[PDB]
Structures are given as C-alpha cells and as structure tokens.
Amino acid sequence: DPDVAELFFKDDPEKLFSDLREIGHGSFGAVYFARDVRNSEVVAIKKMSYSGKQSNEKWQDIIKEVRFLQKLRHPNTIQYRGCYLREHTAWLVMEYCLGSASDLLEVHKKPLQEVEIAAVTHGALQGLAYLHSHNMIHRDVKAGNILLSEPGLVKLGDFGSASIMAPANSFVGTPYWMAPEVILAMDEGQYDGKVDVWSLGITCIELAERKPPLFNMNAMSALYHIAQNESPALQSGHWSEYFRNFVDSCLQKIPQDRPTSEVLLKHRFVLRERPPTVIMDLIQRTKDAVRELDNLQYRKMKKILFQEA
Ligand SMILES: [Ca+2]
Numbered sequence: 120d121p122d123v124a125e126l127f128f129k130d131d132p133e134k135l136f137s138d139l140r141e142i143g144h145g146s147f148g149a150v151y152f153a154r155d156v157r158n159s160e161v162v163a164i165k166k167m168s169y170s171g172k173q174s175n176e177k178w179q180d181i182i183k184e185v186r187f188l189q190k191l192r193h194p195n196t197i198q199y200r201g202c203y204l205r206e207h208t209a210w211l212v213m214e215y216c217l218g219s220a221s222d223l224l225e226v227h228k229k230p231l232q233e234v235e236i237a238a239v240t241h242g243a244l245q246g247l248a249y250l251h252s253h254n255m256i257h258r259d260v261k262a263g264n265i266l267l268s269e270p271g272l273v274k275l276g277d278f279g280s281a282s283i284m285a286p287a288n289s290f291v292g293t294p295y296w297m298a299p300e301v302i303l304a305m306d307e308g309q310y311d312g313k314v315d316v317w318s319l320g321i322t323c324i325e326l327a328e329r330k331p332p333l334f335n336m337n338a339m340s341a342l343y344h345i346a347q348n349e350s351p352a353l354q355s356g357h358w359s360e361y362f363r364n365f366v367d368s369c370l371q372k373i374p375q376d377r378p379t380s381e382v383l384l385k386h387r388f389v390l391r392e393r394p395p396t397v398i399m400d401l402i403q404r405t406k407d408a409v410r411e412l413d414n415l416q417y418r419k420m421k422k423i424l425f426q427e428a
Contacts, residue, residue, distance in 0.1 A: 123204060126185045132203040132210040136164060142422045147180065147279060148208075152215065152425040161215040161426050162200060170207035180279070181209045187278050188213075190253070195246030197266060197276045216266035216274060218405065218423050220322070224262060224329050226408050226420050231401070233362060236326045238397040239265060240365070241389045242273025243319060248380035250275070251312035256282040260318035261296045262325045271398035285312050294338040294345075295331040296321045299372055302346045313377045320369025323362075327353055361388035 136153040142163070143150040150165045167184075169177035188199035188211065198214040220239055223231060231239065243265045250257055257264075259280040266276045280291045286309035292301055298317035300310040325331045332351035333341040350370040353363055365388035371377040383389065394400075405423065412418045 122182050127202050127204050140425050163213045163215045165211045166208055168208045187281055193249040195242045195274055197274045216268040218267050220262035220265040223405055226405050230327045234393045235401050239273050244383055246275040247315045248384055251380050254285045256285050256287055256312045257315045258292050260315050261293055262322050294341050295333050299346045300374055302342050313374045316369050316377055316380055320366050323366050
C-alpha cells in the first residue's frame with residue numbers, strides 16, 4: 120500500500136476526533152469543524168471519499184493534495200496536520216480557521232472596511248509570494264479561499280487546484296476570478312503565478328463590493344468577457360488611491376505589465392500602517408454579529424461560533 124504507508128498516519132481517525140460539524144463541501148467531499156480528543160484542540164478535517172463512483176481519480180486527487188500540503192511552511196498558508204485513512208475515506212487534518220473572507224461578507228452583508236481589506240489582502244499576498252517563490256501557483260484565489268484564524272491571522276486555503284510548477288497551462292480556477300491568460304490557455308498557452316495576482320485583484324473588488332465583477336452573467340459569458348474585454352476596477356471613487364492603484368496594478372491584462380506578488384509586497388496599499396488589532400477586531404465584530412442573527416440555530420453562518428458549542 121505504497122502511498123498509504125508513505126503519506127498517512129496509521130491511527131483510526133474515529134478515535135482521535137469528535138464533534139464533527141460540516142463547515143463546507145465540494146466535489147472532493149466535505150470539510151468539518153472537529154475536536155482533537157488528545158489535547159482538546161479544535162481542528163478542521165477535509166474528508167475525501169474515493170469509492171463513490173470510481174476510486175481512481177478521487178484517490179489521485181487525494182495523494183496530490185496531501186503531497187502539496189506537506190510542503191507548506193508559511194504562516195499565511197493553512198497549516199497541515201497530517202492525514203488518516205478509514206473505509207475508503209481519507210481524513211486530511213488542518214488547523215482550524217473559523218471563517219473565510221467570504222463568510223465575513225455574508226455575515227455583515229456589507230463590504231469590509233478598507234483597513235480590513237488591506238490587512239486581508241496583505242496576508243493573502245504574503246502567502247502567494249511564498250508559493251510563487253517555490254514556483255507553485257494557487258489558481259483559485261477568491262474570498263472563499265482566504266481564511267481567518269484566531270488570534271488574528273489570514274491564511275490561504277483550498278490547494279485543490281494548485282500547481283506545483285510554473286509555467287502551467289491547465290484550464291482551472293473559478294470563472295469569475297480567472298486571469299485572461301488562464302482562459303487563453305483554453306486554446307494552448309501557458310501562465311505564471313501572476314494569474315494569482317490577477318485573481319487577488321478580483322478578490323480585492325469582491326471584498327470591496329461583495330461580489331466579483333461579472334457575477335451577474337453566467338460562467339461561460341464571463342469567461343469570454345474576461346478575455347476579450349477591458350479590465351474591471353473598483354467602482355467607487357471613495358476608496359483611497361493606494362487601494363485603487365493596488366487593484367489596477369493586479370488587473371493589468373497582459374502578464375508582462377502585471378507585477379509579481381513579490382513586487383506587490385512593497386506596494387503602498389499594503390505597507391500603509393494600520394492598527395495591529397485589525398484582523399482580531401474584524402473577527403470579534405463578526406462573532407458578535409453572528410450571535411445576534413435571527414433564528415441562529417437555523418442560520419448557516421452559526422458555524423463561525425462552533426468552537427463555543
Ligand atoms: Ca500541464
């Protein structure tokens with residue numbers, strides 16, 4: 120059992136974790152909030168079954184992600200804690216992040232404050248520059264994959280579409296956030312980690328406006344429009360120039376004009392001094408808002424307070 124013996128711990132996850140509560144799902148399967156019985160610590164577990172239809176590809180997806188996750192050692196990437204295997208289900212365990220940037224947008228039904236967008240953007244950017252420095256590409260940067268964790272850190276999540284080498288040429292990502300060069304690859308081309316810089320630019324707008332541009336058209340049309348049309352920009356003139364320029368820089372259409380994530384780490388938007396408690400306060404005000412939600416037991420965003428139950 121080659122990859123099994125190599126990549127997994129032998130323990131039975133069922134004896135290690137309890138209070139599993141679903142906090143997300145996708146084709147892979149589902150992600151869960153859980154409690155590590157050994158130290159009374161909360162963790163996140165992504166269960167990936169490989170029996171459903173055809174074990175084959177699901178199993179390959181599992182191994183690739185485990186191997187990818189094993190390589191990450193940066194504070195702005197989700198911390199991987201190991202994996203277990205039981206009944207055709209791989210349990211990938213990770214540190215727990217109580218919410219994504221997207222959940223934040225859903226709880227307040229309002230864009231984030233600019234200082235908060237800067238703090239979220241900066242953290243995700245650091246993670247991208249780290250991934251890029253090792254020639255990897257995330258390929259699915261969006262508010263839903265930027266996670267918050269206490270006491271107050273921003274971490275990149277969901278490496279299910281990631282590439283371990285640049286240049287890359289696969290059609291992958293989430294339509295509205297995909298860079299033109301990735302869509303162009305739809306024919307036969309290649310692209311950089313710069314595509315993540317583009318996706319980050321779209322995410323910045325999503326954090327400022329709750330949705331990415333083109334969210335009002337179907338996926339196929341958006342794809343055609345991203346490629347063949349001008350670049351979107353923040354629509355309100357009220358955001359500072361630093362933010363405005365940061366976003367327009369990320370959204371340069373031709374890779375060559377787009378800066379690398381490393382260069383962006385020196386951008387004024389990201390370097391402008393901000394209170395040291397921004398993320399922490401953002402999380403606290405979010406937890407507080409969720410507690411006031413009407414009919415909480417039935418509101419999906421209650422997951423933000425799972426660690427209290
Ligand atoms: Ca390839």
